[PDB]
Design a protein around this ligand. Sequence first.
Ligand SMILES: Nc1ncnc2c1ncn2[C@@H]1O[C@H](COP(=O)(O)OP(=O)(O)O)[C@@H](O)[C@H]1O
Ligand SMILES: Nc1ncnc2c1ncn2[C@@H]1O[C@H](COP(=O)(O)OP(=O)(O)O)[C@@H](O)[C@H]1O
Ligand SMILES: [Mg+2]
Ligand SMILES: [Mg+2]
Ligand SMILES: [Mg+2]
Ligand SMILES: [Mg+2]
Lengths: 465, 465
Amino acid sequence: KTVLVIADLGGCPPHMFYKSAAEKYNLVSFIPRPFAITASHAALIEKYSVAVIKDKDYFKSLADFEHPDSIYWAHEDHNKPEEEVVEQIVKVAEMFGADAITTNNELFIAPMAKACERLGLRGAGVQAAENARDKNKMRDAFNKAGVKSIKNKRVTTLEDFRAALEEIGTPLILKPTYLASSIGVTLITDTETAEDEFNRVNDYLKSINVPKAVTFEAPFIAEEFLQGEYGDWYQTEGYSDYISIEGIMADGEYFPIAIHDKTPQIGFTETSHITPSILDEEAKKKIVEAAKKANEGLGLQNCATHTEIKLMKNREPGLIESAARFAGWNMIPNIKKVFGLDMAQLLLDVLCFGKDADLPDGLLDQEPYYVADCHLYPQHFKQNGQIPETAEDLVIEAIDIPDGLLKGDTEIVSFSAAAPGTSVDLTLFEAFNSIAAFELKGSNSQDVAESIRQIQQHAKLTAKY
Amino acid sequence: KTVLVIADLGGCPPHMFYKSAAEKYNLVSFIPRPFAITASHAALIEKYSVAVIKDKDYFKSLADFEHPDSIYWAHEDHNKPEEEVVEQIVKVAEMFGADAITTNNELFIAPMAKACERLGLRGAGVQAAENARDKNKMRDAFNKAGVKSIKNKRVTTLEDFRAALEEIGTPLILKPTYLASSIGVTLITDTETAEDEFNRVNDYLKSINVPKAVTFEAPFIAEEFLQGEYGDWYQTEGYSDYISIEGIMADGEYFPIAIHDKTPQIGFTETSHITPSILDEEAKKKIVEAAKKANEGLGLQNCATHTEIKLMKNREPGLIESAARFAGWNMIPNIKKVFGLDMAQLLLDVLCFGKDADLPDGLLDQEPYYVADCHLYPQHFKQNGQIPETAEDLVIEAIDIPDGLLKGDTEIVSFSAAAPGTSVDLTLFEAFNSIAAFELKGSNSQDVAESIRQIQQHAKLTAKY
Ligand SMILES: Nc1ncnc2c1ncn2[C@@H]1O[C@H](COP(=O)(O)OP(=O)(O)O)[C@@H](O)[C@H]1O
Ligand SMILES: Nc1ncnc2c1ncn2[C@@H]1O[C@H](COP(=O)(O)OP(=O)(O)O)[C@@H](O)[C@H]1O
Ligand SMILES: [Mg+2]
Ligand SMILES: [Mg+2]
Ligand SMILES: [Mg+2]
Ligand SMILES: [Mg+2]
């Protein structure tokens, strides 16, 4: 079978996705945004695809033929309306007789779904995909679906916000409806400065770049802050009061695969994911039910899912959001390391063969150990005191992890720091701003989580200010 | 305009061809032999093409997704008949609305021509391309064309050869009709051992790999050895008694661009090319006339040409051979360095626009200096005595060029040796076996050629035997 991949940022990382897919399928890659593609990404696409097609228009000169090493968020304009994007996708599919279409990138989910339906291929579902991508429609579907419901309001203007603040009460979450990576997500707790904080993130939001193909009924959503209750859920310290759960939708039914525990965020910036969760079978069961309800509630037909859930009092799961694509970072690879299951090949099996694919019957179990995928950020070294506070940028010489920080049988499997000499802007959003990454392994989750904490605390940065 | 490139080995090197082409045209690359493609080659194709299509069939497992650093001659089978190859090429062209098709590789010239004619695009010409690729048909066309004619005979069997030897006389050239790089080309001078030497190269020839799409009326051609007379041509030492001339055919007319001088071969293995020739305007005129006659004699319509000519007594040009593609090594790039003319863009202009392209009116002149592209081989170090003779392979540690070897204002512009640790088989044909390369520049051709000699003589190899 021939699988068209719409190749862009995020989701199951290029280092796993292309090889896993090409092992069983003939991959054709469409690159709608050549400028979104790193050098390493471009070499993987070419290595594992039998054809590659790029959007011609985003080539003006030779300088446009260069690949950067790192892209944190795509900088350049993409001003084609959705229906045109659908048309490009359909055209590529028909050029290569694609039996399936898939993507790892948020921004192309909606149009891909329309293409699949036009082509009679399996997909997220047209309306379902819109639900999965506009947070107001998403939250509305969740409320209808009988999971924990919370007050939410569309916000466009200062007046909209002020209303919302009255109706919802603090604590209040205000976030854009159409981005990711916690971009813009703000916690309103003080009715005094609440309008001020609306104005600042309002302005910030029109300086970020998204394709014109990204539709939304309002710029912001305000909603009840879902309060954690860590102790109603976890028996030991080390984790946080949210998780993610990775699943597959197949012919409209939800198949859970694995729940990931997390380390505490910095602000709303994520720090680490641990495959798989230490939570007890009853907690996992409650999480699974909420994610089933939410995703089936969205209407999703065939796709991967990444669903984020707040661990609230009385063991109530609160739906934070759900995406119709794979978890980012190394969560999908780490599922394969732990359990041997290749969720990328499993999605493609489902797209090409439906419930004929070999879907597990429940969350995977019998993990031989735990694996943590962890990032460090400048803000860790501001909190460390390694970076002075009065510092709007720096230039990075080295990042070192002192010995003696690991608990129990935990190990450092890998570690990679921003290359010596790397320039760092210290004004920009942490999430774009990771400067080091590491993988731990160990038989004891609590020890793994403690080792992550120690490493965050004691890592040594050498830079010049 | 959209240009389909059939991407394989040889001709204008990937480091120039893809960028030059993509500067003016949208390139679609067809890779009929993924295993012919080095890592550096694959990255260039992907960097500069708006689409890439590979032949699916030459992917069995993940191991087939690897790119080697170096390919001297494509190892794997390609057993599709010509008409099928034509069909693939036509299919790709029609998929992308190609306005032109081109290739740098000998082995795809014939089929490309048939595709172009089927598509109503400019090309070599169906019959012309067959002439340019079967050396018996080629030599026949040359003889008809009124250049120096020589006796030639088809050879398939020991009996065919023995006849030929009687009819032609020594000195005699026996060579395969369908390969390149001097593979199999043998000099018969002694009627005693002549049959023996036929049997050995007969056997050797069935152990080399070519696609089944390569048609020929006989395996070998025997022909008169064209005798040099260096002194009838050159006024100084340093060169050899053959040259090449690089041209463009446009609507059936020959356009010379540049003549390259050469350093003496090792056996029949080429050593260096110097852009442009030092030969006087009358010698150049004679060379141009022979190359016009030969190429126009073949019937070539639209293509690049690389024509090799023996410098024979009384200033008679002897046609050695002519290919309907670009010279290999760095001859095309070095034309651009010397004269500023980009012959790759000039070919594509001609394919898309005919004699509307900006063809020069005569050989390029006013060179600001000379540029030599030079290779060293193991056999240089056997002749140096650096490698013992009783040595069937070695492993290369380093290659060093002593100071004080350069004449006049000559310079070493670049130098690259086989990477320290490289394994070298010393049984295999020199031409596949280059272990070092360098570029010289200088205002004095005779000094440049002398500096090449010194470097060949005195280079130092460190290896283990
Ligand atoms: N309603 C909410 N209640 C509690 N926390 C939230 C809420 N919305 C967002 N967050 C926090 O902010 C993070 C980012 O918000 P999310 O809805 O996941 O948007 P994004 O698509 O930017 O990641 C979440 O992981 C969660 O920690
Ligand atoms: N008829 C000939 N007379 C003299 N030299 C020849 C003849 N044929 C081949 N050679 C020599 O052998 C080399 C390789 O032969 P050529 O016909 O160019 O085949 P290939 O396509 O392998 O390069 C030529 O460059 C030339 O030096
Ligand atoms: Mg999100
Ligand atoms: Mg999120
Ligand atoms: Mg040849
Ligand atoms: Mg030749």
